[PDB]
Amino acid sequence: PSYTLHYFNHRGRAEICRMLFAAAGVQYNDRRIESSEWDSMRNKMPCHMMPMLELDNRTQIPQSMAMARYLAREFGFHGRNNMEMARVDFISDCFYDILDDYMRMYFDGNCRMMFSSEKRMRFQETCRRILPFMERTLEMYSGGSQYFMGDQMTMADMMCYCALENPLMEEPSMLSSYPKLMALRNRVMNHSKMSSYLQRRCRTEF
Amino acid sequence: PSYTLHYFNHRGRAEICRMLFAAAGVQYNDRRIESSEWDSMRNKMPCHMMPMLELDNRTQIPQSMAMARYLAREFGFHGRNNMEMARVDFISDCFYDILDDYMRMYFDGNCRMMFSSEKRMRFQETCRRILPFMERTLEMYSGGSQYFMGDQMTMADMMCYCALENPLMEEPSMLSSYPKLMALRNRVMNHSKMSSYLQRRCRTEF
Ligand SMILES: *SC[C@H](NC(=O)CC[C@H](N)C(=O)O)C(=O)NCC(=O)O
Ligand SMILES: *SC[C@H](NC(=O)CC[C@H](N)C(=O)O)C(=O)NCC(=O)O
């Protein structure tokens, strides 16, 4: 099959899909659209929502987590039965929540930069609610010494990686009391296929 | 298996799961917890996030959409292959977005009532972005005369129903230019198993 990823020149909400493609060794068109060009087409497209995954130059699927789950099931980075999928999903959705609240500090619902302390406090609260739960949740398998699903890396571990990259640039110390999360992120970034993708990827501020 | 749904006395983020249980004819413990009682246990529970689905008095899975997808796959109200699942997911996630922004007008991230115009405008924008896309998306199958996945009702149609109930109480006219969405909601509410559940369910303001 053929894949096209539509998004801005950001890591942002599409980065989970890029990591999935990189991990699976699957080539795709990585379409990075300038904001004003996207903005001028908005009222002319049946599907305007960003990011969006296009399959076989045909089917358009927006909603970043829906896109990621599809790539995960396709490439074998999701759960293998219903229970396992539920676990991969709640972990991933928890990290999406963090990323979503982070993005809401800077961007409106129409993708415009909003460049106040209230949004930052929502974000910081969202971290305090979620991260200790994720540290514990990770510990459920293999004492938390490996991945969220034991020895198989899945989209949950990738979400843990990409969702926290910006928060870590803003506050490099914020994961200091979640040592298992840090070793997992370090494990993901050194994983086969993932190391070279991450080291050769363009440097963007989001 | 055995099911327990934990949430407040609200329709809110858990209502998708209740509809799923009702549609599948599956009995569960519908646990409606008073807020202050939930609040007093918060720092004593490994999993404090609301809503939460408990399986066999054992596994705790929060994240309302993760919970719903699990019940949907279990009961047969999800897609039957990867592509179909991606379509059910983006539709459901679009409606979650609407519901999420609606809930953010009234509740903080710690479940407290925040009872300003800014949050309402985010919400209203989110409706304008999403609803026309959903009207069109529905039209992809069977001219939009049936359900999002043709003749099978899935969690996507249920989301379309429960996500808009409160917005419709606040503005009963807001779906007037999406006639296919309205006929779908009316189709869901008269569906077998769903009609009696909806007519006998407790009246709550959220
Ligand atoms: S760029 C801002 C808007 N995107 C989203 O909010 C997508 C949210 C999904 N939950 C996701 O992909 O995670 C956006 O695309 N606004 C423009 C529009 O036409 O919808
Ligand atoms: S009640 C407010 C918080 N709930 C959520 O935000 C859950 C969001 C998920 N995305 C979902 O289920 O849809 C909450 O539970 N805060 C308390 C806590 O301990 O996390």
Author numbering:
A (entry chain A), B (entry chain A): 2 to 116, 125 to 215
Q: What did the published study say regarding this structure?
A:
Among the crystallins, S-crystallin in the cephalopod lens has been shown to have an amino acid sequence similar to that of glutathione S-transferase (GST), which catalyzes the conjugation of glutathione (GSH) to various endogenous and xenobiotic electrophilic compounds and is a major detoxification mechanism of biological systems. Overall, our findings have revealed a novel structure for the cephalopod S-crystallin and provided crucial evidence that greatly aids our understanding of the evolution of S-crystallin.
We determined the crystal structure of the S-crystallin Q108F mutant at 2.35 Å resolution. In contrast to the above, we observed the presence of a GSH molecule within the active site of S-crystallin, located between the N-domain (βA to α3) and C-domain (α4 to α10) of the protein. There is a disulfide-bond between the thiol group of the GSH and residue Cys112 of S-crystallin. The two domains of S-crystallin are closer compared to those of GST-σ in complex with GSDNB; although the r.m.s distance between equivalent Cα atoms of the two structures is 1.3 Å.
